[PDB]
């Protein structure tokens, strides 16, 4: 169905002693083995609440932001969903400040659109060296700003894979009033996240399921076909 034990092929196993004492109170009364465990039911209800809230937000005709920058796992997932669902995304590392400072984003994306429109219009307007340099700038833009050139305004909603590990993203989100969802870990702060989703992300076998479920949420909300979040089976996605 939706986020039950059958789909959960991994819910614990996060490396120990990287934890937040107040994140030992919201979830999983302390285990004697001290291994980072997570609760099933509370996470399920929190995910359901996030699902319905993002449904309502999308029905309000708002903007959304999705993030992924891990080595290959979360990056691959976010790229698949980006070519599946039109959401704001960054394929590569956060630039330190990319949400709080906003005017610099606007000028960067204006230059990006100038370059894209020049390249599309250009049949013979530059030399080979000039075109190579322009293509180099285009590629550099595709690396970071390329994932957000599609939309030209602030995304009203955003997900975070790990707010403490994405310290820049969580800081810049707390700078603004935008509501934020995050796959909260045992070493995070619930007050930094607007809507708590306590789940293991360092174990990829759970963050892949979470990413798929958010993809289902945004697809169904956008009046688009949906693949999971209501299905008696899910595909195996394990590291090789």
């Amino acid at each position: 169905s939706l986020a039950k034990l059958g789909e959960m092929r991994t819910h614990v196993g996060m490396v120990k002693r990287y934890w937040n004492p107040k994140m030992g109170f919201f979830i999983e009364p302390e285990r004697k083995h001290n291994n980072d465990h997570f609760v099933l039911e509370l996470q399920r209800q929190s995910l359901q609440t996030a699902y319905n809230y993002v449904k309502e937000v999308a029905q309000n005709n708002g903007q959304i932001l999705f993030v992924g920058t891990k080595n290959d796992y979360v990056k691959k997932l976010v790229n698949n969903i980006a070519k599946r669902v039109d959401v704001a995304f960054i394929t590569q590392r956060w630039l330190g400040g990319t949400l709080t400072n906003f005017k610099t984003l606007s000028i960067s994306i204006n230059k990006l659109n100038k370059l894209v429109e020049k390249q599309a219009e250009n049949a013979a307007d530059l030399t080979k060296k000039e075109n190579l340099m322009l293509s180099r700038e285009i590629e550099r833009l595709e690396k970071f700003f390329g994932g957000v050139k599609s939309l030209k305004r602030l995304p009203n909603l955003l997900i975070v894979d790990d707010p403490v590990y994405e310290k820049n993203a969580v800081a810049e989100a707390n700078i603004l009033r935008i509501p934020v969802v995050a796959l909260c870990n045992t070493n995070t702060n619930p007050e930094l996240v607007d809507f708590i989703i306590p789940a293991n992300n360092h174990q990829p076998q759970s963050t892949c399921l979470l990413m798929n479920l958010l993809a289902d949420a945004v697809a169904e909300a956008k009046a688009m076909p949906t693949m999971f979040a209501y299905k008696p089976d899910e595909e195996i996605q394990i590291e090789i």
Partner: peptide, 5 residues
Amino acid sequence: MGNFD
């Protein structure tokens, strides 16, 4: 808050 408007 659970509304945007």
